[PDB]
Amino acid sequence: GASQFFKDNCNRTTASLVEGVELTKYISDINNNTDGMYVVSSTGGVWRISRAKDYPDNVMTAEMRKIAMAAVLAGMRVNMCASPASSPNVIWAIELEA
Amino acid sequence: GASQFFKDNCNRTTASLVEGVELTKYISDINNNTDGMYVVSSTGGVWRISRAKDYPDNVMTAEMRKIAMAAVLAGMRVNMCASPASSPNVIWAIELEA
Amino acid sequence: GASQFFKDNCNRTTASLVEGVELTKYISDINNNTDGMYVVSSTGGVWRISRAKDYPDNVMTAEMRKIAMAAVLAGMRVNMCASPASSPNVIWAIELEA
Amino acid sequence: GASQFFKDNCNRTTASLVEGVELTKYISDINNNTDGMYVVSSTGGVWRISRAKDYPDNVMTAEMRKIAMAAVLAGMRVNMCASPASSPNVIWAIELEA
Amino acid sequence: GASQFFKDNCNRTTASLVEGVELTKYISDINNNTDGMYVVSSTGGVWRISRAKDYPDNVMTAEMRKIAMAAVLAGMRVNMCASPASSPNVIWAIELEA
């Protein structure tokens, strides 16, 4: 379950906490209409990972993509802070667990 | 099989949906006229990975390369949206599946 | 147990040595005020990974992220030299132990 | 067995095909006059991995280094298109086999 | 044991060959005056990994970090060509062994 720290930081925002998601697909598409990379859960939910060219968000967004690939490869769960103002909902923070 | 999201995205393009491919070889080639990154399926189908010079597309092509190499290492399947305009067909989108 | 080298180096500083920590969650956040990379231990303790825009510190901070991810994926323990000046405490050095 | 695609491509070149190589060592060296990245096979043969500073070859040579490492860590075989011009022979294409 | 090629190259330098080293710790430090990347062996021996900003040594030194980290995670041995002129001794070449 989400760390107290992660839930606290989500509840400072207007986003929604989604806990224990099992990501089973990870998508890279070159279409110019994308807003980043996408992950799909075992129940068919889709979320987007944002992109940023410069420091510092170029670090966090890369580590979001590393978390997604490690969660899909190993069957690890994640918790998400996801904003419903975009569709697919955009990930503002992600926690990989165990 | 392809998420609905990935299927819908491929249908907005001229490229073809190829589902459930088992990639078994990953090629890097710097020779004249054949330079590129390619993947080979267990039955001998060949595709070229997209390439891109600049941000944002070079983030997307880096993640395709990571997806294709992870699929080959782990024996995981991928779904592809691949363009028939050249041969080998060029992967415009890829979905790693667990 | 922390190498004597790592302990000697942390003894030069105002930070504190934390030994044998089991990291169980890895967080990337781009929210507006809590952005950063963090790790959470099995007891719920939280640390922020150092960030640096330029060479050479951006080499070491990238390896701190790689160490934190590998520790969470593998259940490998780490030793930290962590500054109590902020909450979460900032990791200024980390040792991955096999 | 190398894919026919990889054999056909190598056969366009002045390089030679080496199939089914088991790489057991991976070397990085920054000493004068020996600097480079190299691989050594189970029988003791040595190859240099190509290098390139610029796009697009900087992509393919980085993938060559990822393939080499993965082959050595997992005991996977590779097929190589290697130029006999210099010693060690330089890898111009490589195919990782699962 | 070290390849003949690795040994021949190290014998050309002022550095020492160290064979069969079992690395068990990997350190990243950004503290003043002790900053750097380091590895520690099962005996307590400590080495500094070379670093470089510019091409081409930025490639080799990144691969040295990847070799160190892989050796620690998987308990693989390395061979090193390490200079005694500094403490910790600096790694000028490294060979990962399967």
Using an 8 Å Cβ cutoff, are D15 and B37 in contact?
no
Min Cα separation A41/chain C (Å): 19
Tally C-beta pairs within 8 A across A and C: 88
CA dist., res. C20 & res. C2, Å (int): 8
Strand (E) or helix (H) holding D77: strand D77-83
Residue of E96, E92, E66 lying closest to D40 (CA atoms)? E96
Selected residue of D63, D64, D79 to mutate for chain B interface (largest B Cβ count, 10 A): D63
The verdict on a CB contact (< 8 Å) between A96 and C51 is: no
Q: In whole angstroms, give the CA distance from residue D43 to residue C17.
A: 46
Nearest Cβ partner of B61 from A24, A30, A44? A30
B90 close to B47: Cβ distance less than 8 angstroms: yes
CA nearest to B79 within chain A: A27
Q: How many residues does chain A have?
A: 98
| Rounded Cα gap, residues A15 and E8, in angstroms | 60
CA distances from B4 to A25, B8, B94 (A): 11, 6, 13
Contacts D44 to E, Cβ<8 Å: 3-4
Whole-angstrom distance, CA of residue C27 vs CA of residue C47? 10
**CA distances for C79 relative to B65, C4, C20, C68, E30, angstroms:** 33, 11, 6, 11, 14
Nearest chain B residue to A27 by CA distance is B95
Residue D80: phi and psi, rounded to 5, are -125, 145
Classify domain D1-98 by CATH architecture.
Beta Barrel (2.40)
Closest CB to E34: pick one of C12, C63, C98.
Answer: C12
The C-alpha torsion from D11 through D14 and D15 to D16, rounded to 10°, is 60
Would you kindly state where each structural domain of chain D is located, as residue ranges? 1-98
Residue A82, helix vs strand vs coil: strand
Report yes or no: C61 and E29 within 8 Å, Cβ to Cβ: no
- The verdict on E6 touching D (C-beta cutoff 8 Å) is yes
E interface test, pick of D26, D29, D48, D59 with most E CB neighbours within 10 Å: D29
Residue B8, CA distances (Å) to A37, A49, B2, E2, E92 in order: 15, 19, 10, 54, 52
Closest residue of chain B to A33, computed from CA coordinates: B9
Given a contact cutoff of 8 angstroms between Cβ atoms, the answer to whether D76 and D43 are in contact is: no
Q: How many Cα atoms occupy the beta-carbon half-sphere of E55 within 13 Å?
A: 6
* Residue E59 near chain D (CB below 8 Å): yes
Is E98 within 8 Å of D73 (Cβ atoms)? Answer: yes
CB proximity C34 to A under 8 Å: yes
Contacts of D4 in chain B (CB under 8 A): 44
Task: For residues D80 and B45, give the distance between their C-alpha atoms in angstroms, rounded to a whole number.
Answer: 19
Chains in contact with B, where contact requires at least 3 CB pairs less than 8 Å apart: A, D
Full 3-state SS string of B18-34: EEEEEEEEEEEECCCCC
- Say which experimental method was used: X-ray
Of the candidates B4, B13, B60, the beta carbon closest to that of A28 is on B60
Q: Do D72 and E98 touch (CB under 8 A)?
A: yes
Peptide bond into E84 cis (omega under 30): no
Q: Does E63 touch chain D (CB under 8 A)?
A: yes
Closest CA to E35 of C66, C55, C22: C55
Beta bridge partners of A22: A77
E81 lies within 8 A of chain D by CB: yes
C30 contacts on A by Cβ (under 8 Å): 50, 52, 57, 60-61, 92-93
Contact yes or no for D50/D90 (Cβ under 8 A): yes
- Taking the C-alpha atoms of residue B23 and residue C86, their distance in angstroms, rounded to an integer, is 47
How far, in Å, CA of B50 to CA of B35, rounded?
12
Tell me the sheet residues that pair with C95.
Answer: C79, E27
Chain E contact present for D24, CB below 8 A: yes
In angstroms, what is the resolution? Answer: 1.4
Burial of residue A17 (number of CB atoms within 10 Å: 0-12, 13-18, 19+):
middle
**C65 touching A, CB under 8 A?**
yes
Contact E67 D23 (CB under 8 A): no
Centre a 10 Å sphere on the Cβ of residue B69 and count the other Cβ atoms it contains: 21
Compute the nearest-CA separation of A77 from chain C (Å): 10
Residue with token string 């294409």: D93
Report the length, in residues, of chain E.
98
Distance of CA A48 to the CA centre of its chain: 6
- In this structure, the strands spanning D89-97 and E16-29 are unpaired
| Reduced 3-state DSSP string for chain E | CCCHHHHHHHHCCCCEEEEEEEEEEEEEECCCCCCEEEEEECCCCEEEECCCCCCCHHHHHHHHHHHHHHHHHHCCEEEEEEECCCCCEEEEEEEEEC
Q: Are strands B89-97 and B46-49 parallel, antiparallel or unpaired?
A: parallel
Helices (H), C2-97: 4-11, 57-74
